[PDB]
Chains A and B, each alone.
Chain A
Amino acid sequence: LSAEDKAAVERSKMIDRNLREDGEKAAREVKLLLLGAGESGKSTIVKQMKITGIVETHFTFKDLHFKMFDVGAQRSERKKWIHCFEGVTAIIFCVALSDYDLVNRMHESMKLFDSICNNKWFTDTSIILFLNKKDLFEEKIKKSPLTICYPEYAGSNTYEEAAAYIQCQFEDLNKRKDTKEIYTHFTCSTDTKNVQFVFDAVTDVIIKNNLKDCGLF
Chain B
Amino acid sequence: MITAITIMALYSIVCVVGLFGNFLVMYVIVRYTKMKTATNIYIFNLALADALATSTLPFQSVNYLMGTWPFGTILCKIVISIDYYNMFTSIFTLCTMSVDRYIAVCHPVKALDFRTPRNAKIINVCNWILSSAIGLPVMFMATTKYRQGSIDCTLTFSHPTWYWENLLKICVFIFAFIMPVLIITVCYGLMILRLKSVRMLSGSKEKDRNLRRITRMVLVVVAVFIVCWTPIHIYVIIKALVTIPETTFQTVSWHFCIALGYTNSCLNPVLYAFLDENFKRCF
Contact = CB atoms under 8 A, between A and B. Distances in A.
Interface of A: 24, 27-28, 62-64, 177-178, 181, 203-204, 206-208, 210-217
B198 A207 contact: yes
Interface residues of B, number: 29
Interface in B73-116: 100-101, 104-105, 108-109, 111-113, 115-116
B115 to A, nearest CB: 7
A213 B217 contact: no
Contacts of A208: 200
Interface of B: 37-39, 100-101, 104-105, 108-109, 111-113, 115-116, 195, 198-200, 203-204, 206-207, 210, 214, 217, 276-279
A64 B105 CA distance: 16
Contact of B214 (A64, A181, A210, A216): A216
Contacts, number: 59
A66 to B, nearest CB: 12
Nearest to B277: A215
**Interface SS of B by simple majority:** helix
A211 B217 CA distance: 13
Given A24-B116, A178-B206, A210 B200 contact: no
A180 to B, nearest CB: 10
B112 A207 contact: no
A28 B112 contact: yes
B204 A213 contact: no
A204 B207 CA distance: 14
Nearest to A212: B277
Contact of B104 (A28, A64, A178, A211): A211
A208 B210 CA distance: 12
Given A207-B108, A207-B198, A215 B214 contact: no
B44 to A, nearest CB: 14
19 contacts: A24-B116, A27-B112, A63-B109, A203-B109, A204-B198, A206-B111, A207-B195, A208-B200, A211-B104, A213-B37, A213-B115, A214-B39, A214-B100, A214-B101, A215-B277, A215-B278, A216-B101, A216-B214, A217-B210
B214 A217 contact: yes
Contact of B39 (A27, A203, A206, A213): A213
Contacts of B113: 28
A185 to B, nearest CB: 13
A154 B86 CA distance: 70
